[PDB]
């Protein structure tokens, strides 16, 4: 019942971002695109980094390496909370889709 946005185009971009998060571990091509957005915009997940805890095939206590403040190979495996971006991506990436 609750919704993060009211505009139709903004809420559908939000679901599109969350949909490709589900396809992150099922496709390497999909995962590479999201790694750029999370790296360039310095963010993790849709609204928070804790969104990854709900993604199947995403290991426990693991976030994508692009979520780390400094992107190194394997930095997301057994990550530390103080070494990743906690803020989500949806608002800062597509906020201009609001009315």
């Amino acid at each position, epitope marked *: *019942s*609750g*919704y*993060v946005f009211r505009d139709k185009v903004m809420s559908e971009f939000n679901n599109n971002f969350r949909q490709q998060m589900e396809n992150y571990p099922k496709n390497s091509h999909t995962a590479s695109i999201l790694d750029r957005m999370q790296a360039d915009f310095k963010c993790c997940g849709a609204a928070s*980094y*804790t969104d990854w805890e709900k993604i199947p095939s995403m290991s426990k206590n693991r976030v994508p390496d692009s979520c780390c403040i400094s992107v190194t190979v394997g930095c997301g495996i057994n990550f530390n909370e103080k070494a990743i971006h*906690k803020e*989500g991506c949806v608002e800062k990436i597509g906020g201009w889709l609001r009315k």
Partner: nanobody
Amino acid sequence: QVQLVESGGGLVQAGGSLRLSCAASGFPVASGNMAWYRQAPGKEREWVAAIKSHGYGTKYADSVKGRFTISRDNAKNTVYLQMNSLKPEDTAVYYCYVYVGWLYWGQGTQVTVSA
């Protein structure tokens, strides 16, 4: 925009269970410090359950530890309050709050436990 609409309140017997929901509109629950309050008529208002933003942890009042469990679903942007082993001392109107600089709350929902 800060909307908080409590629902799920009702009447249950002593020792039963009840689940409250707090449909928040206008902000993501995953990055918001949210807590469940309650106030019975005659008594003073009090906070019972809480979940901080991101993974900063949850917190519970001592009178409800182990019985109540606060949860956070992102697909519906809703904070839940699972209330197990309810006591007649838990009869109150339950409100959900949000702390984002200031405080915002909803209308609340009535919870009553018989016997």
